[PDB]
Structure formats: C-alpha cells, structure tokens
Enzyme design. Structure first.
Site, mmCIF file in Angstrom:
data_model
loop_
_atom_site.group_PDB
_atom_site.id
_atom_site.type_symbol
_atom_site.label_atom_id
_atom_site.label_comp_id
_atom_site.label_asym_id
_atom_site.label_seq_id
_atom_site.Cartn_x
_atom_site.Cartn_y
_atom_site.Cartn_z
ATOM 1 N N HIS A 4 1.051 -0.862 0.373
ATOM 2 C CA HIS A 4 -0.247 -0.040 0.109
ATOM 3 C C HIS A 4 0.696 1.182 -0.289
ATOM 4 O O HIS A 4 0.496 2.722 -0.451
ATOM 5 C CB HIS A 4 -1.401 -0.006 0.842
ATOM 6 N N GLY A 62 2.671 6.074 10.183
ATOM 7 C CA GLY A 62 4.388 5.529 10.368
ATOM 8 C C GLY A 62 3.607 4.406 10.631
ATOM 9 O O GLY A 62 5.297 4.021 10.362
ATOM 10 N N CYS A 114 3.305 1.835 9.964
ATOM 11 C CA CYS A 114 2.359 0.354 8.762
ATOM 12 C C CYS A 114 4.376 -0.357 8.533
ATOM 13 O O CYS A 114 5.205 0.856 8.058
ATOM 14 C CB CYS A 114 2.405 0.724 7.050
HETATM 15 C C1 LIG Z 1 -7.562 3.906 10.999
HETATM 16 C C2 LIG Z 1 -7.385 3.698 9.692
HETATM 17 N N1 LIG Z 1 -7.632 4.656 8.543
HETATM 18 C C3 LIG Z 1 -8.820 4.361 8.473
HETATM 19 S S1 LIG Z 1 -6.135 5.902 7.775
HETATM 20 O O1 LIG Z 1 -5.568 5.991 8.579
HETATM 21 O O2 LIG Z 1 -7.650 6.182 6.900
HETATM 22 N N2 LIG Z 1 -5.961 4.526 6.933
HETATM 23 C C4 LIG Z 1 -6.684 3.404 5.985
HETATM 24 C C5 LIG Z 1 -5.687 2.349 5.645
HETATM 25 C C6 LIG Z 1 -6.145 1.352 4.695
HETATM 26 C C7 LIG Z 1 -6.041 0.116 4.562
HETATM 27 C C8 LIG Z 1 -4.508 0.084 4.553
HETATM 28 CL CL1 LIG Z 1 -3.720 -1.675 4.427
HETATM 29 C C9 LIG Z 1 -4.259 1.455 5.612
HETATM 30 C C10 LIG Z 1 -4.425 1.991 6.236
HETATM 31 C C11 LIG Z 1 -3.997 3.389 6.948
HETATM 32 C C12 LIG Z 1 -4.220 2.311 8.417
HETATM 33 O O3 LIG Z 1 -4.278 1.517 8.524
HETATM 34 N N3 LIG Z 1 -2.762 2.862 8.880
HETATM 35 C C13 LIG Z 1 -2.503 2.488 10.630
HETATM 36 C C14 LIG Z 1 -1.984 1.844 10.755
HETATM 37 N N4 LIG Z 1 -1.745 1.678 12.261
HETATM 38 C C15 LIG Z 1 -1.720 2.033 13.561
HETATM 39 C C16 LIG Z 1 -2.955 3.690 12.836
HETATM 40 C C17 LIG Z 1 -3.176 4.768 13.881
HETATM 41 C C18 LIG Z 1 -4.056 5.666 13.661
HETATM 42 C C19 LIG Z 1 -4.525 5.819 12.125
HETATM 43 C C20 LIG Z 1 -4.043 4.673 10.798
HETATM 44 C C21 LIG Z 1 -2.860 3.435 11.245
HETATM 45 C C22 LIG Z 1 -4.402 4.593 6.635
#
Ligand SMILES: CCN(C)S(=O)(=O)N1Cc2ccc(Cl)cc2[C@H](C(=O)Nc2cncc3ccccc23)C1
Ligand SMILES: CCN(C)S(=O)(=O)N1Cc2ccc(Cl)cc2[C@H](C(=O)Nc2cncc3ccccc23)C1
Ligand SMILES: [Cl-]
EC number: 3.4.19.12
Lengths: 305, 298
Positions: free
Chosen positions: B41, B136, B138
């Site tokens: 991603h 951040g 990921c």
């Molecule tokens: C809360 C998640 N979202 C809605 S996001 O931040 O808009 N979002 C969408 C999304 C979609 C698909 C995939 Cl594979 C990854 C993500 C991202 C995601 O999961 N990253 C995050 C990972 N771990 C903790 C996280 C805490 C807070 C924020 C984001 C985190 C980013």
C-alpha cells in the site's frame, strides 16, 4: 490506537552484555568502552554472603582470577576496582559496540526496560517500574545477576539499574550503575524484607488520561476534589501521596484531554470506592501503575479520540 | 521468581529496519540481503497497473543516514520487494514463517525506519493482533527467535475500527479475512486462547499461587461444553499433549487444571488475583512459560 506495556529496543544493550566468572560464580557484566561493570558479590562464596568483607576478599584477587567472556572471545582483565557494590574490571579491549550512554539514578515510580541475561546471553526484554518500596517486580532466575535496566530516549542509552538479588517475597533489589543500592538493601544474605508496597498514584492518573485519549470515559464523574481530600482517601487504599509536583507533571495530559488533574483525581477516588463493575480500562481489570506521564505522552497519539 | 510479558531481544531485527518513502506515503521496510520488504500500500485498488507506472527511483529507501539505491521491484501478494544495490551487512540468519492463531511473537514498532519500542503479543483466534501502533507504524514486523535464527512472522499493514490491527506474513498473505484497502471491514467476534490460559495457570502454580487448585478432575468433552459457553477456544488432545511437561513438573494433570479453569469461569476470582492479574491471561503459550521459567538465551 492501542496501549501496551512497551519496552525500549534492546539492541544497543545486547552488544554490551558479557559473562563474568570468579571461581565457581558466573554472572553478567556490562562492557562499556574498556570497563566491565558487574555486581561485587561475584567474588563471594554462598558462605561469604552472610557477612562478607568485600575489601578483604578483593585484595586477595589478581586480574587473572576474573574470567570475562564476550561472545566466543575471552577478554583480558588488566585492572580492577570497587565502587560501592559494583566491581569495575578494566579490560584490554574497548567494546566497539559501545553506544552513546549515561549512568542515571532514578526515583521510585520511574519506569525502565530490563534485558534479562544468563551466561552473558540476553534471553528477554520487559518493562517495569521502581516500586515506592525501592524493589522491582521482575522476572529473574539464578544467573540473572548483572542484568541491567535502561531507558533510550533518543539514541542515548541511560543505564539506571543493575540486578543484584531476590528478596523472600520474590521481588528484586539492585543498584544504580555507580553501585549504590535502591532502598535500604545490602548485598548480604541477611534478614531483609521489602517494606509494605504502595500504588504509584501519579502513574495511575497518567494511565487514566491514556484511556481518555484512546476514547474511554465511562469512569469520569461530575465531581472535583481538593488535593488534601484526595490524599486522605488515597492513603486509605495504600496509594502514594500525590504532590503538587505530580499535579504539575500531569499538566500537559490535562490540557490535551480537557480534564483538570483534580477532576481526574475525583474519578480515581470513585474507582477506588466502587471497583470496575465488570468493566475494563485499556484491557485491564486493575488500575495500572507502571506507565509514567512521560511514557503515556510517548506512546499515545497527540489527538484524543 | 516473577512473571512478565517478555519479548525476544530485538537487536537482530533493529539492524534490518529501513524507511521507505514513495510519493506522499512514508512507512517502514525490512532490509534482508539485497531486498527491502514493505506493505504494497506504499504505492497507493489494482496494484499491478498502479505499480507498472512506478520507476525504481520513485521509491526512496533510507537506512539510518544512508540512501539505498533501488535497482528493481516486484510484488508478492500484499508485500512489495525492492531490490537494492547494497546487501545489508547486518542481515541475521532468518526464515519467513506463517504462524497460527494463539501463537505469540514480538513486535518491534517503528516510525520513519527507527525502532521505538518492543512488545509481546499474540495472534488472536479472529486473526487480529491487539497491538499499539500509530500512523507511520506500517511495515513494523513480528518475530520469534529459535536459537540464533530470526523467524519473521508478521508485517503490520492496518488498523481496524475497533483499534485492533491486521497484517500479513512476510510472503504478503494476510492473517484473517482482510484486504489492504479503505473499505467496510471489521474483526470477527474473538475468543480466549484456552491452551494459553492453562499454561499461565501452570506458571502461577510454579510461582507459588495455588489458591485456585481443587481436588476435581474433568473430561475433555465436559470441559469443551463449558468452555464453548464462555467464548473459549475448544481444547484439543494436541493441546493436552503440549501441556504434558508442565503437568509433570507441577503434579497437576491437564484435566485436573481444566476443572480449576471451569470453577474460575463459573465463580470468578472473588477479589483475588493470579500473577498480579484479575483477568485470565491468554497471551503466554506453553513454550513461553517453559522458556521464561528456565532462562533460555539468544
Ligand atoms: C485508522 C485507519 N484509517 C482509516 S487511515 O489512517 O485512513 N488508513 C487507511 C488504510 C487503509 C488500508 C490500509 Cl492497508 C492501511 C491504511 C492505513 C492504516 O491503517 N494505518 C494505520 C496503521 N496502524 C495504526 C494506525 C493508527 C491510526 C491511523 C492509522 C493507522 C491508513
Ligand atoms: C533466592 C535468593 N537466594 C536466597 S540465593 O539464591 O541463596 N542467593 C542469596 C543472595 C544474597 C545476596 C545477594 Cl546480593 C545475592 C544473592 C543471590 C541471589 O539473590 N540470586 C538471584 C537473583 N535474582 C533472582 C534469583 C532467583 C532465584 C535464585 C536466585 C536469584 C543468591
Ligand atoms: Cl527518575
């Protein structure tokens, strides 16, 4: 989101762990630059431990009596000295893996990571706190002496604890890296016991603010309290007194969440009175006291849910 | 004495963490030999045609204060593999392993290719992990150490609406019915890892906490009937066999301990704790208990 007991990455400390042998005793040492730091009880027998005269025992030793092993390499001891309850072994090689470091003495309520070692080999890392009675609730077996406690804020390792002994209740006692014990404990097998322990109030308050940041408010109430009335109630549940320093330290979390410290104190008083009633706070059914205000700000988001 | 949630020493993994930036997205990568592994991603859908537009120089890889040159790229399931010009001199002996629900592992949480914390966790029966991650994180990885060999088992991809986390093995296959995209997805109803609670009760006995022991025994069938009613995972004969060593050490047969668990589920703890906990802990496997109560080193 989420709230875990998190330890610092242990790599900078792993590269410093060595094995120290004196006669039949084997324990761990901390190799920094050309000095290996270890508990002075490495020179004792089990019999010596009742009333050891460490000065009398040390004067009878020479450099070649101390065997230091770093991985599969034997280090050569070229000098030795005692500083309080720590033995400092001057070695012929400086540790090339020596990180940026400081020796810091902590206060009760402070947290740190422990890298538990056996035979100079690291086996695990866990997070813990210096209890108000100066003991730590660690997980240590025989051979773990010399294992160290540390914090790594930025890229500098701050060594704050070295493991020396286990008390009869299963709790642990040790020194700072200058060999000064935390608490009234002595490196002697004498009748000594940890004082009655108390809950670290400022840490429970910080953890309640972390729960609010993560979206939970079920425990809040419409009341406030004076600092004195809170302490009169808290002392009855074996909680440490909350000082004005503790209130000032919680200022940032109070401003971030919009809840005054004395209002959070009112929720705490109520939780102590009623319990949790089948509910949990951050996945726990007990009030957690091993997260400092500083740990909560570091781990939690800057935006409240 | 003492019983803590203990993670593996993280040093062998710290030397593998890098920062990967592409467009506006910045996340973590795992640098092993001449390949950097990271969530696909980062290219963000149809990932193959999104990827074909990208050139090697679009992916910025930073290892400490050193820039790594990307010379190739390919996708394997939900992981992106970036071929770099330099082999990681800190590459440890390693394997990629896929774990089962109930198994535990250590997570080295990173931000901008810098490790900031290590914690221990378990793959829940609903395939999520109850981790601690911010934006951040990921690309942060899960691992076990079996001697001097690091077994990578998890790579973080996303957070679900309940605050729990979802990710893949190092071959890019998700744990659980998740997809890497912004869509309506939720964690299934979770259950308690029964064999792990039993292991933790044996650890409590080893540490001198025996108030919950009773004279009773039970059958695997009667226990499973009761356990299914409290949202506990079924206990299999394999679980019973796996708990054999702890049963012989403490002198408490696995079905003898199952009867203790039955009484705890029906009566609660009555103001008492077990290993400083008022809940029944399920994130220590039988092997974790034997390892912590024996001092195995790495
Ligand atoms: C809360 C998640 N979202 C809605 S996001 O931040 O808009 N979002 C969408 C999304 C979609 C698909 C995939 Cl594979 C990854 C993500 C991202 C995601 O999961 N990253 C995050 C990972 N771990 C903790 C996280 C805490 C807070 C924020 C984001 C985190 C980013
Ligand atoms: C249980 C402690 N003992 C009574 S002991 O093993 O006889 N003992 C006495 C003693 C006295 C003073 C000093 Cl400074 C050190 C020691 C030693 C000691 O504390 N080592 C241990 C340390 N940590 C966890 C330990 C778990 C288990 C065993 C031993 C541990 C050795
Ligand atoms: Cl301090």
């Amino acid at each position: 989101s989420g709230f875990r007991k998190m330890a610092f990455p242990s790599g900078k400390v792993e590269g410093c762990m060595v094995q120290v042998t004196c006669g039949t005793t084997t324990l761990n040492g901390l190799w920094l630059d050309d000095v290996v730091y270890c508990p002075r009880h490495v020179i004792c027998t089990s019999e010596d431990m009742l009333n050891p005269n460490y000065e009398d025992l040390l004067i009878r030793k020479s450099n070649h009596n101390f065997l230091v092993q770093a991985g599969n390499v034997q280090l050569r001891v070229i000098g030795h000295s005692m500083q309080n309850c720590v033995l400092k072994l001057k070695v012929d090689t400086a540790n090339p893996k020596t990180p940026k470091y400081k020796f810091v003495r902590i206060q009760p309520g402070q947290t740190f990571s422990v890298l538990a070692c056996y035979n100079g080999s690291p086996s695990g890392v866990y997070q813990c706190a210096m209890r108000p009675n100066f003991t730590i609730k660690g997980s240590f077996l025989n051979g773990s002496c010399g294992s160290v406690g540390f914090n790594i804020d930025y890229d500098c390792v701050s060594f704050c604890y070295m493991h020396h002994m286990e008390l009869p209740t299963g709790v642990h006692a040790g020194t700072d890296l200058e060999g000064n014990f935390y608490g009234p404990f002595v490196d002697r097998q004498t009748a000594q016991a940890a004082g009655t322990d108390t809950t670290i109030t400022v840490n429970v308050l910080a953890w309640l603010y972390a729960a609010v940041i993560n979206g939970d408010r079920w425990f809040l109430n419409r009341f406030t309290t004076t600092l004195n009335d809170f302490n009169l109630v808290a002392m009855k549940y074996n909680y440490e007194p909350l000082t004005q320093d503790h209130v000032d330290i919680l200022g940032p979390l109070s401003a971030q969440t919009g809840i005054a410290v004395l209002d959070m104190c009112a929720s705490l008083k109520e939780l102590l009175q009623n319990g949790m009633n089948g509910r949990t706070i951050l996945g726990s059914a007990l009030l957690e006291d091993e997260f400092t205000p500083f740990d909560v700000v570091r781990q939690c988001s800057g935006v409240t849910f």
